A paper describes a structure:
As a further example of the general use of our design strategy, another [name] mutant named P156FAfFer, where Pro156 was mutated into Phe156, was produced, which can also assemble into both BCT and SC superlattices. As a proof-of-concept study, we introduced His/Phe at the C4 interface of [name] and created 3D protein nanocage arrays with two different lattice arrangements, including SC and BCT. As expected, crystallographic analysis revealed that the designed residue sites are involved in interactions between the proteins in the two 3D lattices.
[name] is the main iron storage protein in most living organisms, playing a key role in iron homeostasis and detoxification. Canonical [name] is composed of 24 subunits, which self-assemble into a quasi-spherical nanocage with an outer diameter of ~12 nm and an interior diameter of ~8 nm. [name] has prominent octahedral 4-3-2 symmetry, and each [name] molecule contains 24 C3–C4 interfaces, 12 C2 interfaces, 8 C3 interfaces, and 6 C4 interfaces, which provide several potential pathways for metal ions and small organic molecules to diffuse into its inner cavity. Thereafter, we introduced a self-assembling strategy by designing π–π stacking interactions at the shared protein interfaces involved in two different kinds of 3D protein nanocage superlattices, which is referred to as key protein interface redesign (KPIR).
Residue numbers in the entry:
A (entry chain A), B (entry chain H), C (entry chain A), D (entry chain B), E (entry chain B), F (entry chain H), ...: 3 to 169
Write the structure that this text describes.
């Protein structure tokens, strides 16, 4: 028996967070191929959101690994389809990505507070080390892109920022 | 308009195959991390079904890209959760994968037959080029794994084939 | 006698397609040197359409080679002058290139359907392998350029896309 | 079970084409060592037809492999002895090979036609990918050798082509 | 004076954990040379448990270093002799080590809990950074070895795992 | 305005020479693939007249570029099909090419005489620099090929000079 | 808005710590150039406290960056001048630095306790990661320098430790 100091509601929250990072993986994939659509056509954003979808999928597998290491049982649910089919302008899509990563951050903070309430020192530091500082950086990066996309405006600017920054 | 000789029924099956390949990616991920579970503990299979999950995910993006190249529209649906939570013995899982890649093959074949009936020569060759011959080889490999897993038996055999073959 | 399973109307269609790809070679050359004209002056487009004229000329020689390999007889006709003398804005010229490559695609699809009706398995796969997927990619690429040229607008944008993309 | 969309008359055709490609291997061997005979003594042809024998033997193994991938059963038959013991002039032997690869081509086309009649999309592409275009090129090459061997005539010319071309 | 926010019961706990990590070092040494004994003769395990002994001895020195950095006083005690003289089957010994690192884990958690109760933020992170996550991975690894050693069974299997895995 | 000392009659002859060089490119292409025809089968000449077609096409773009550099306007006309469909013997074709490059020379000479009569010093040197001395060498080479093709005779000779000289 | 789980009192302490670390940078600079003064003349310490000034300045920018990453607002205040103009003996200065890094530690600890009380898990780990364990090591090093400076005495000793240790 490897399980030690690993609460059962902790275990249930990791199962949830796994679903959330998969849901995020699938939302970014939806964005990536929206900018590959011929009537949108921003290759840099295609690149940028494909990698994002790769990363939160890593997130999920890092949480899957942690579940096994602590001695719990992975339990999967349906990954729900993304909230939209099309994503508007390049600025609109980065605003949704900001809203999405803030939603993920809040869950990671709730999981941390949960783990903390049950005295799980290791699960706290694991979440601090793999997710919390990286979320903070993800959020600040998106925040800067939104300021920039507003600064360059529409038309020529949207093209330029796609190519020269997101790619 | 880039759309040419691309039938709306073909477009809908593509979306249907995007969901299917994503479904297979999510099943393999389930298996991969079942073999990482401490009570199962087969690192070779864990490695083997993790790559398999990557492949059918690559399959989905290859279809997403093709939907865009032909001037269609991606429409995503939920990714249903895997049929099982645990996957039994190493031989039991390889059988489970054989049944899945056959299901996907029949689906890819029906999608070919649909495309052919609408006169879509390029779609036919594209499915032939990227999917039909790969499925044949994938099924043949699963079959040989099943035969070899039966030859090596349970216990020491299952270990050996895990490390030496799938690893 | 090398001729085997090679229909006489097939042979007549290859002779036609040779003329069409030459006509396309000559249209792109007309575009390439229109952007080299001092009152137009977009060097990137000059590059971009010179290479296009090189490529459909390869197309012709690939069809000439196939004619000989199958045992037919190449028969040449006049290459007709391009439909226009000047080609308008950079966006206007890429729209004509989209119309031209769709016209070529349709002929390649008609030749395929023709070859198919006469049971010519090899000529079908030859057309699938050298022309059909490449046409699909050519069309999607042009489609994206047209979206982008509309996005960046006129003046500064037209210059920027010429230099940073087409060159 | 791995067999899927693999019809029993297709499987019987595959067994017939393994025998024919082995039969062709054995004719080419016969010729290659005819030219090694001291009353003939054409070292270039020996080397050329030895290689062609390796070639159609690789064909046979390629088909045996395909039979196993689809879940068929290889069933072998006697390989009949070549039609002749000696092969006349070098030009006579190249004409014998042209006739032979045309027979193989027709047989390969009939196998495709049967595969297509049962809706075996994958079998059709496999034959297209590995055999149909390679047969066209081999036939054209033999055709060009026959024209060239007529051009150089007999005596000194036959010597020259053997050494400078077939070697 | 360098001591700062370093409480006396924390300092006493550090002295207790130096003894325990030295005790663990000395158990692993006992096992490693049990497997070197000619009636046992498992060279992989000898090498694996020798290294684990070096390991928990590095742990001890890491803690002695920490005691000095905070301005504590190292106070050493006898290292008790391991609980057994011989360690049964290889699987028996891996079970003995699992039990041992769990004891160390619980002790390490209690030390964290005490450090946190006195508000020693730095002591908590130090234990998180150097010990807590490493203990989880060691426990999971021992757990996986125990499942695998059951899988290969006794006799030939025990031989194989010793050489191919622990070595 | 960049146009200086560039007479309108000179401008029109340039367009007339663009057509002529394109006409020569299309003739050589016709010859090149006549020698690739299985009943003719002279790979050396095929290679030789393919390069020749590339050269006079380079000639046309060199004239197109010069029309633009002097501030004129390209006006394209049809490219007439080659005078013959087949080209007889290897010697017969080299004679056909000699007659063509002489025609092109007289045309280039008349274009020089026209430019000189209008006082266009730069155009004169440009034609001298890029065309007059190249035509002299091209004609001299064709002449030597004709003399050598007559020396080597028909049959074996024609083969030999094809492979060893034009190849 | 990027601001999430970032309390306004935490924001104000960050600004307060930016000032403190800048204050320490300006103190070390004062010391560094006291040891460069001709009547003091200890190049090793000059080098040692110049680097120390660089470090706590790096500390301030690391806090400035963190204020921005969390969506707060930098507010700068005066940097007060160092407590002394001269710094006495080499041992006297190292004691002065030990008192300063302890002051900064208590400040960093209170900032941690403040962040923890407002539930800011990421801020806590960030301070742990970048500051708490570095301060422990910095204080331990100053302590050892003080002990060594007392062992080597005044005069020749002070020289020796300056060049051989701080240099």
């Amino acid at each position: 028996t490897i399980r030690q100091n690993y609460n059962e509601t902790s275990e249930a929250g990791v199962n949830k967070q796994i679903n959330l990072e998969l849901y995020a993986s699938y939302t970014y994939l939806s964005m990536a191929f929206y900018f590959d659509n011929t009537t949108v056509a921003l290759p840099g954003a295609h690149k940028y959101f494909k990698k994002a979808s790769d990363e939160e999928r890593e997130h999920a597998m890092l949480l899957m690994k942690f579940q096994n290491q602590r001695g719990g049982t992975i339990v999967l649910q349906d990954i729900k389809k993304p909230e939209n089919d099309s994503w508007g302008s390049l600025k609109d899509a980065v605003q949704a990505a900001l809203a999405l990563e803030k939603h993920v951050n809040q869950s990671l903070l709730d999981l941390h507070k949960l783990a903390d309430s049950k005295g799980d020192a290791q699960m706290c530091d694991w979440i601090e080390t793999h997710f919390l500082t990286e979320q903070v950086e993800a959020i600040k990066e998106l925040g800067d892109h939104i300021t920039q996309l507003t600064r360059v405006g529409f038309g020529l600017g949207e093209y330029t920022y796609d190519k020269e920054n997101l790619g």
